[PDB]
């Protein structure tokens, strides 16, 4: 007679991470509009015919 059993195997799945996006707001915007254009407002026309 061969005496019974004496054999198991481990309940084991290794852990890892997939498709974890680096979605931080650290560079979250790029858009700009200038603070108006350059103009002259200080001078008269002096249009005395």
């Amino acid at each position: 007679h061969v005496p019974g059993g004496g054999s198991v195997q481990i309940v084991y799945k290794p852990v890892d991470l997939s498709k974890v996006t680096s979605k931080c707001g650290s560079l979250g915007n790029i858009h700009h509009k200038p603070g108006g254009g350059q103009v002259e407002v200080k001078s008269e026309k002096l249009d005395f015919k």
């Binding site: 407002v41 200080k42 001078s43 008269e44 026309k45 005395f48």
Partner: protein, 112 residues
């Protein structure tokens, strides 16, 4: 020494009234007997306007405040005409400052 234009020695009109002045009381009263008042046309008024004129030049060149006036019934062309006539008036109080040239001793010569 009181400087006056050479071409108006008649420079005065005059008026003498018998009624003395009244003071409107509000202090101790002076015992007044006789008084003087005077109106004078002069070119010192040119010294006054010389700044008020450059102030209009500075304001108008910068277009400062002009949107209150315009909004409430005006156009920039009106600010120009007003200043233009005030530049004519600047030359008017200088023309009454001219020490005028002599006219004596100018002739045609004789026809033959």
């Amino acid at each position: 020494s009181i400087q006056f234009v050479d071409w108006c020695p008649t420079g005065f009109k005059v008026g003498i009234n018998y009624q003395p002045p009244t003071v409107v009381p509000g202090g101790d009263l002076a015992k007044v007997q006789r008084a003087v008042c005077m109106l004078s046309n002069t070119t010192a008024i040119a010294e006054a306007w010389a700044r008020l004129d450059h102030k209009f030049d500075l304001m108008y060149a910068k277009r400062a405040f002009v949107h209150w006036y315009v909004g409430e019934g005006m156009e920039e062309g009106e600010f120009s005409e007003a200043r233009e006539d005030m530049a004519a008036l600047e030359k008017d109080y200088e023309e009454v400052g001219v020490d005028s040239v002599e006219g004596e001793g100018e002739e045609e010569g004789e026809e033959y």
